[PDB]
Amino acid sequence: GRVRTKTVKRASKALIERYYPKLTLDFQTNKRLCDEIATIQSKRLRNKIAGYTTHLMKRIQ
Amino acid sequence: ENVWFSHPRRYGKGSRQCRVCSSHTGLIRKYGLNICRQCFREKANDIGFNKFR
Amino acid sequence: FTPVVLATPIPEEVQQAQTEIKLFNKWSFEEVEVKDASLVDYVQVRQPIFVAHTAGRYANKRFRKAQCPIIERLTNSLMMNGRNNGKKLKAVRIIKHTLDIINVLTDQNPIQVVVDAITNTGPREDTTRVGGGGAARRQAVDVSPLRRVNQAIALLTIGAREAAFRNIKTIAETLAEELINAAKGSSTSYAIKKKDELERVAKSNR
Amino acid sequence: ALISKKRKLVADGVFYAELNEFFTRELAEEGYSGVEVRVTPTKTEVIIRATRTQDV
Amino acid sequence: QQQQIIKIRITLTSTKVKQLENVSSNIVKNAEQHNLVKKGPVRLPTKVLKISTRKTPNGEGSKTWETYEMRIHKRYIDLEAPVQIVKRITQITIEPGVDVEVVVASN
Amino acid sequence: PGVSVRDVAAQDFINAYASFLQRQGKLEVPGYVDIVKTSSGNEMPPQDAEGWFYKRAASVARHIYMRKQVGVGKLNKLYGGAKSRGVRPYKHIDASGSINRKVLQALEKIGIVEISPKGGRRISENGQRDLDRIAAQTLEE
Amino acid sequence: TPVTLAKVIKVLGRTGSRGGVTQVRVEFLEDTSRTIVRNVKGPVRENDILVLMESEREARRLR
Amino acid sequence: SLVVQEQGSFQHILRLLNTNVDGNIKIVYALTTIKGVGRRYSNLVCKKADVDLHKRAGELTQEELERIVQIMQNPTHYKIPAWFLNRQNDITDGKDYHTLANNVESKLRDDLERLKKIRAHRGIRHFWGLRVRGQHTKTTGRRRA
Amino acid sequence: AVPSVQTFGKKKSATAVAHVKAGKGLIKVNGSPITLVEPEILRFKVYEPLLLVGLDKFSNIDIRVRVTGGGHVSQVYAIRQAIAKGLVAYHQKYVDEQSKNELKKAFTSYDRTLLIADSRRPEPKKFGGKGARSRFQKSYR
Amino acid sequence: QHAVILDQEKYDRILKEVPTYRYVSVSVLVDRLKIGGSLARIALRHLEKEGIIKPISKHSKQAIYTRAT
Amino acid sequence: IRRAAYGVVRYVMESGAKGCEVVVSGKLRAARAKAMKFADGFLIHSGQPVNDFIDT
RNA sequence: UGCGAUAACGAACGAGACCUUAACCUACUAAAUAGUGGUGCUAGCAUUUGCUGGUUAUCCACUUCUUAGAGGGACUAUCGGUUUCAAGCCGAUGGAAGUUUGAGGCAAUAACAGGUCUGUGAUGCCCUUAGACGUUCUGGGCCGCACGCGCGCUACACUGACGGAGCCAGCGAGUCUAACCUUGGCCGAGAGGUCUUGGUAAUCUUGUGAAACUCCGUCGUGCUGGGGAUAGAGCAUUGUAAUUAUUGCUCUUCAACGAGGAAUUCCUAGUAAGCGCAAGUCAUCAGCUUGCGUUGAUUACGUCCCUGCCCUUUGUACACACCG
Ligand SMILES: [Mg+2]
Ligand SMILES: [Mg+2]
Ligand SMILES: [Mg+2]
Ligand SMILES: [Mg+2]
Ligand SMILES: [Mg+2]
Ligand SMILES: [Mg+2]
Ligand SMILES: [Mg+2]
Ligand SMILES: [Mg+2]
Ligand SMILES: [Mg+2]
Ligand SMILES: [Mg+2]
Ligand SMILES: [Mg+2]
Ligand SMILES: [Mg+2]
Ligand SMILES: [Mg+2]
Ligand SMILES: [Mg+2]
Ligand SMILES: [Mg+2]
């Protein structure tokens, strides 16, 4: 039951839309820069958003 | 005066009552509360007891 | 092989277990080749165990119970009818005495007898209720190997339990008789008898 | 006072509840909004939040 | 009196962990800037006071129960400290919602 | 080669020490043996009945040895059991408070246990020596 | 009766009114490149070898 | 403390206190068939009577049977401590009797008749055939008694 | 000082703290040797870390395992975890890392819970039932 | 139905027929021969003392024996 | 009822709140009772944010 | 829920996110209310150091285990497979954890003539208001039994009963705002009594030495030594009061019950089930409930066949809505 909501997918889409000269195919690097380029209110939501961003970057590649 | 409260109510249901409404049944006396279970649900956030899990 | 001495002296009979891992301390898991094909990777040997108690996870995914060893699944099927829920220590004791009795009668390997009993009372073709009711056709379906080994364990332990109920014979020797008769193929055993009935109804209802 | 801390904190919660309902009943026209009880050493302070503080 | 250490203990009890740790950090900060010797804030197991009452006022319904609960967080600090300037700083700096008690131990 | 009563199995030691205590005959069984059940939750008196006080005393002495101090109430809780209350579900009932107590005076007369200034009974020096000697004999056989 | 050993190549899907039968496709172990679609009662996987008392019968109960 | 073999000098069903005590059953549980003798009383009597507790009640010789009967019938004299008996502080003379085979029906009937004759409520419920120990008669016992 | 590591093992609620120091081959549980652990059929559970790597890996160390919590099977599954983790920690800290890797291979190729605690925890009970999942019986009549 | 006390012919039948029993237990002595469980246990102890049957497990509630040699 | 309820709903709403909701339940000269709602703005109903930002 | 189709595009509540708990952290801050190791100091038994006992301005050091603050961690990571290379799903490896990580708490719009006026000093109206429907007291009743039904407990035993021995939890709670939790000693077969003691509690009850379970014996297929109903006599405790047995204990009486027709409930992994313990109400009384741990399976990882619910299409003379 691992479907991601629109608050994960939309935020991840916006993060790739304005931070492609940034974040890479590594979840830990994406997770660390999601603390600085965005104000995500919880650690679980930050990890979900960074993991979906990583999934979409690996998909874009 | 003669026999008005002549019956001993040192114990049992009729010894104690809710401090809010004086109800002998359904009382909670855990931690010295002496509130009935219907008024405790109303006042339980004022006592400090919160729904967590 | 070489007797090593320690401060707390480990006995020789359990120091002998460094060379080969065997059940309880006696019967090897080597040369317990499963005689019937199509049931390998569903009767689990080739990882030998010491005792038939392994508090592990097998019912979290689908086919993980085929990785539980066959002796442990046989112990686990002995913990039923309610009053024996829990009591894996009792079930492991029953299984240990069972393999003692199968070593005494018919001297060859008790693990081989248990595996032979499983492969001999797995039902090959069962039936199913086709249609939406009891009053309909019954149609024959052949059985998956995992359901074959499952029904084999269930039939052997249910026949053992009912034979051990209300008589002098203990559950270890009634189960040992069930496994011996099923391994040779006897029809004097509950599991072979029930397998014949389940196959025969499917023969008649193809 | 020699009670356990469980019963002491529970009884302070009950005292808060009783004070809060007493001020709810008393200060109805006076725009009551809440009470805070500050237990300092040697005195306790009962602070009433009310809109018509001049009427209080 | 003449800067003789007298071995007090401050017991800090509260149902609110944020303000309780504010008090604990204040006491440890004062005792470290005063160069006091201390056994630090020892945090006791939290008392989870559970009350499982019945959710309904009636009998009617599916039988639903409520676990209201209050947590008691408790800490203590040992201070081998002078008698005057430390009773001053424990007289002052009292947070609401946190109950202090100071006991002198010569055992 | 320094054998204590931890290097001997509990059943083997308690059997050997009970047979030793009965053979040497000093422990002064209380006279209400063979008429007494050993627990309220118990249903029948012990099936040994020529003895069994020596085995209760050996188990108590080994218990006192392996703990620091054990009193009559801890002994009653240890030897008490599930009471078959008939039509009602079972319940833990503490054992006979006279038997464990009289075991404790019986061992204190023969010098196994001691008055233990923090409470119940410790094991005395002589009792520690005795239990270690039967522990060595139980292995070396 | 010469029973035949057949290896599951393709698991087609689950039918039965109750949902308890799986249609699979089996290649015979001896004389392979001979696929028949056959019903299976219990839990069946890929590569699962199973015994058949007929080599000539299909699974006609689907969708 | 060692096991021993044996041989069969045995005799079958035997009469004792007007009760056919059966053979082929160990003596404590053979004496249980006597009314007023249970399992505790049997164990205590076979202990006071110097009876081996293992010997099947037909291996037991008639001198031992006579000692067993004497201890059952006169139990205070053989140091059975009268908290262990039935009719402690009896009803009418204050003695401590243990009541035996045909007499426990007689004393039960005698005390039910005493409770009926006094007109006590327990005697009246005994007369009517209802439950006397304060049970709820609404639901249970709804076939007999 | 003496080379000593301190580890622990866990079943459901049974914690076993092992103290593996350099010694002469000694293995003790809670005061007593590894040959008497009770229960007797689960003695090969606590023998499993001993017989997987060989006893010559244990001939140079003294292990003392203090176990609390749990029950008679959870404590055994904590003993074997404590012993295996203690030997692995000792061969990490003092013996070579390539020796640790062979030991860890021998343990995890046999049973993962020799080194890794079982993560299965008791689910809470909820109202209207007697367990986590099962409910009371409903009637309709 | 079960001879719970031992006469000489049943003793002679035990000492003759427990040899050639492959597996000897309580239930074997209660079924194949006609003594109770009590004499089955006493007989098992006596015959492994005399050395005609050898133990395999010797557990309470399940005693497993085999012929000598 | 509507006048008072809207008069506090918009008073809350332009006192600087994300949202407000007034529910009035009861009867008025009528043998039948109805509950009517008066909402304005953004509200939440589930979660710890109710304990955070919702005042009831 | 999202992908996708697309006269829709972009949003809000609900879901999710959130919070509490459980699981990992030899990484941080520490602790005589937790523990460990040496030993300031000892001390015992067996030996040639194993097992212990005891003192923290009448020792030192440490935090692995324990506790609780702040954090870290998982995001289905990585790699295959598959799907329209889309959301996703499946497998393997790694991992403390890959079932929304397990479990809950909160939980929208619309309703129901659902339950509650007998929870309240919540309440309209009505009734009664001094031979009261107020209040108190005395005694009884709520327990009354030809019977029908529902939730359970105990069972029908040898995978067991009995006895002896072994021996292990976790969630709790507890009195000076008066007698609560009670260790230890002594008496008592037992229930209990009595002299003291610790505890306002990570300190003491309490290592709740729990039960199931394990080992060794007695039984031995017999309604038996399964079962413990009914009933008799006695001893205690609580209480002003125990009779209609409050409950506890001892002896005795030893009933149906030989695994249950038609039917029907609950359940997918530390789960079902077995097992006791604590709390609730409690002066006394748990066969109940809420929780907690102990032991721990079989079977599916699916389908719409039954039942219920939802959605779409269709019909309607229904809209008080088929009880039309
Ligand atoms: Mg006492
Ligand atoms: Mg359960
Ligand atoms: Mg929301
Ligand atoms: Mg939510
Ligand atoms: Mg469209
Ligand atoms: Mg730590
Ligand atoms: Mg209505
Ligand atoms: Mg009421
Ligand atoms: Mg009255
Ligand atoms: Mg009623
Ligand atoms: Mg027992
Ligand atoms: Mg504990
Ligand atoms: Mg009552
Ligand atoms: Mg209670
Ligand atoms: Mg109730």
PDB file of N, CA, C and O in Angstrom, chain E residues 4-26:
ATOM      1  N   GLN E   4      30.105  26.137  53.163  1.00  0.00           N
ATOM      2  CA  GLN E   4      30.147  24.720  53.489  1.00  0.00           C
ATOM      3  C   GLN E   4      29.076  23.998  52.684  1.00  0.00           C
ATOM      4  O   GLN E   4      27.905  24.393  52.704  1.00  0.00           O
ATOM      5  N   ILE E   5      29.484  22.950  51.965  1.00  0.00           N
ATOM      6  CA  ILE E   5      28.556  22.208  51.125  1.00  0.00           C
ATOM      7  C   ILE E   5      27.663  21.332  51.997  1.00  0.00           C
ATOM      8  O   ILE E   5      28.137  20.636  52.905  1.00  0.00           O
ATOM      9  N   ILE E   6      26.354  21.387  51.747  1.00  0.00           N
ATOM     10  CA  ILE E   6      25.374  20.829  52.671  1.00  0.00           C
ATOM     11  C   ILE E   6      24.540  19.712  52.065  1.00  0.00           C
ATOM     12  O   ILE E   6      23.691  19.153  52.771  1.00  0.00           O
ATOM     13  N   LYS E   7      24.740  19.382  50.783  1.00  0.00           N
ATOM     14  CA  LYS E   7      24.140  18.225  50.101  1.00  0.00           C
ATOM     15  C   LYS E   7      22.605  18.294  50.089  1.00  0.00           C
ATOM     16  O   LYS E   7      21.907  17.530  50.755  1.00  0.00           O
ATOM     17  N   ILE E   8      22.095  19.261  49.332  1.00  0.00           N
ATOM     18  CA  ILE E   8      20.662  19.341  49.066  1.00  0.00           C
ATOM     19  C   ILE E   8      20.310  18.454  47.878  1.00  0.00           C
ATOM     20  O   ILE E   8      21.190  18.006  47.133  1.00  0.00           O
ATOM     21  N   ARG E   9      19.018  18.186  47.705  1.00  0.00           N
ATOM     22  CA  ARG E   9      18.490  17.532  46.519  1.00  0.00           C
ATOM     23  C   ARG E   9      17.210  18.240  46.106  1.00  0.00           C
ATOM     24  O   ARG E   9      16.332  18.485  46.940  1.00  0.00           O
ATOM     25  N   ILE E  10      17.122  18.568  44.822  1.00  0.00           N
ATOM     26  CA  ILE E  10      15.954  19.200  44.232  1.00  0.00           C
ATOM     27  C   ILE E  10      15.196  18.136  43.461  1.00  0.00           C
ATOM     28  O   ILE E  10      15.755  17.497  42.562  1.00  0.00           O
ATOM     29  N   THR E  11      13.929  17.943  43.811  1.00  0.00           N
ATOM     30  CA  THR E  11      13.057  17.007  43.122  1.00  0.00           C
ATOM     31  C   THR E  11      12.072  17.810  42.290  1.00  0.00           C
ATOM     32  O   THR E  11      11.385  18.693  42.817  1.00  0.00           O
ATOM     33  N   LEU E  12      12.007  17.491  41.002  1.00  0.00           N
ATOM     34  CA  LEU E  12      11.317  18.269  39.986  1.00  0.00           C
ATOM     35  C   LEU E  12      10.244  17.371  39.392  1.00  0.00           C
ATOM     36  O   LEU E  12      10.570  16.398  38.707  1.00  0.00           O
ATOM     37  N   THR E  13       8.973  17.681  39.631  1.00  0.00           N
ATOM     38  CA  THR E  13       7.916  16.843  39.079  1.00  0.00           C
ATOM     39  C   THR E  13       6.927  17.681  38.283  1.00  0.00           C
ATOM     40  O   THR E  13       6.599  18.809  38.660  1.00  0.00           O
ATOM     41  N   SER E  14       6.494  17.141  37.144  1.00  0.00           N
ATOM     42  CA  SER E  14       5.640  17.896  36.237  1.00  0.00           C
ATOM     43  C   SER E  14       4.961  16.940  35.279  1.00  0.00           C
ATOM     44  O   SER E  14       5.458  15.845  35.033  1.00  0.00           O
ATOM     45  N   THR E  15       3.844  17.377  34.713  1.00  0.00           N
ATOM     46  CA  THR E  15       3.233  16.651  33.610  1.00  0.00           C
ATOM     47  C   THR E  15       3.645  17.193  32.249  1.00  0.00           C
ATOM     48  O   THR E  15       3.130  16.717  31.233  1.00  0.00           O
ATOM     49  N   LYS E  16       4.556  18.161  32.199  1.00  0.00           N
ATOM     50  CA  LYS E  16       4.935  18.825  30.960  1.00  0.00           C
ATOM     51  C   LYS E  16       6.445  18.769  30.788  1.00  0.00           C
ATOM     52  O   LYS E  16       7.186  19.459  31.501  1.00  0.00           O
ATOM     53  N   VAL E  17       6.885  17.962  29.823  1.00  0.00           N
ATOM     54  CA  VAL E  17       8.302  17.677  29.647  1.00  0.00           C
ATOM     55  C   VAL E  17       9.094  18.894  29.172  1.00  0.00           C
ATOM     56  O   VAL E  17      10.250  19.053  29.583  1.00  0.00           O
ATOM     57  N   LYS E  18       8.493  19.785  28.376  1.00  0.00           N
ATOM     58  CA  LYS E  18       9.207  20.957  27.867  1.00  0.00           C
ATOM     59  C   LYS E  18       9.590  21.916  28.988  1.00  0.00           C
ATOM     60  O   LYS E  18      10.764  22.277  29.138  1.00  0.00           O
ATOM     61  N   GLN E  19       8.617  22.312  29.808  1.00  0.00           N
ATOM     62  CA  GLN E  19       8.902  23.179  30.939  1.00  0.00           C
ATOM     63  C   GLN E  19       9.716  22.485  32.018  1.00  0.00           C
ATOM     64  O   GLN E  19      10.532  23.146  32.673  1.00  0.00           O
ATOM     65  N   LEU E  20       9.543  21.173  32.192  1.00  0.00           N
ATOM     66  CA  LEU E  20      10.366  20.452  33.155  1.00  0.00           C
ATOM     67  C   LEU E  20      11.834  20.432  32.739  1.00  0.00           C
ATOM     68  O   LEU E  20      12.723  20.644  33.573  1.00  0.00           O
ATOM     69  N   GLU E  21      12.110  20.208  31.454  1.00  0.00           N
ATOM     70  CA  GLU E  21      13.487  20.275  30.985  1.00  0.00           C
ATOM     71  C   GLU E  21      14.023  21.694  30.968  1.00  0.00           C
ATOM     72  O   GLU E  21      15.235  21.875  31.100  1.00  0.00           O
ATOM     73  N   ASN E  22      13.151  22.693  30.829  1.00  0.00           N
ATOM     74  CA  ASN E  22      13.580  24.078  31.002  1.00  0.00           C
ATOM     75  C   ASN E  22      14.083  24.329  32.419  1.00  0.00           C
ATOM     76  O   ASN E  22      15.154  24.923  32.604  1.00  0.00           O
ATOM     77  N   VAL E  23      13.348  23.841  33.426  1.00  0.00           N
ATOM     78  CA  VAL E  23      13.785  23.976  34.817  1.00  0.00           C
ATOM     79  C   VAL E  23      15.068  23.198  35.064  1.00  0.00           C
ATOM     80  O   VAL E  23      15.988  23.696  35.721  1.00  0.00           O
ATOM     81  N   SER E  24      15.143  21.966  34.550  1.00  0.00           N
ATOM     82  CA  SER E  24      16.323  21.126  34.741  1.00  0.00           C
ATOM     83  C   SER E  24      17.572  21.739  34.125  1.00  0.00           C
ATOM     84  O   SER E  24      18.634  21.752  34.763  1.00  0.00           O
ATOM     85  N   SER E  25      17.453  22.284  32.913  1.00  0.00           N
ATOM     86  CA  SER E  25      18.572  22.971  32.288  1.00  0.00           C
ATOM     87  C   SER E  25      18.938  24.245  33.032  1.00  0.00           C
ATOM     88  O   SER E  25      20.123  24.573  33.119  1.00  0.00           O
ATOM     89  N   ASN E  26      17.953  24.954  33.592  1.00  0.00           N
ATOM     90  CA  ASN E  26      18.249  26.143  34.388  1.00  0.00           C
ATOM     91  C   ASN E  26      19.036  25.801  35.649  1.00  0.00           C
ATOM     92  O   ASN E  26      20.012  26.485  35.979  1.00  0.00           O
TER      93      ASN E  26
END
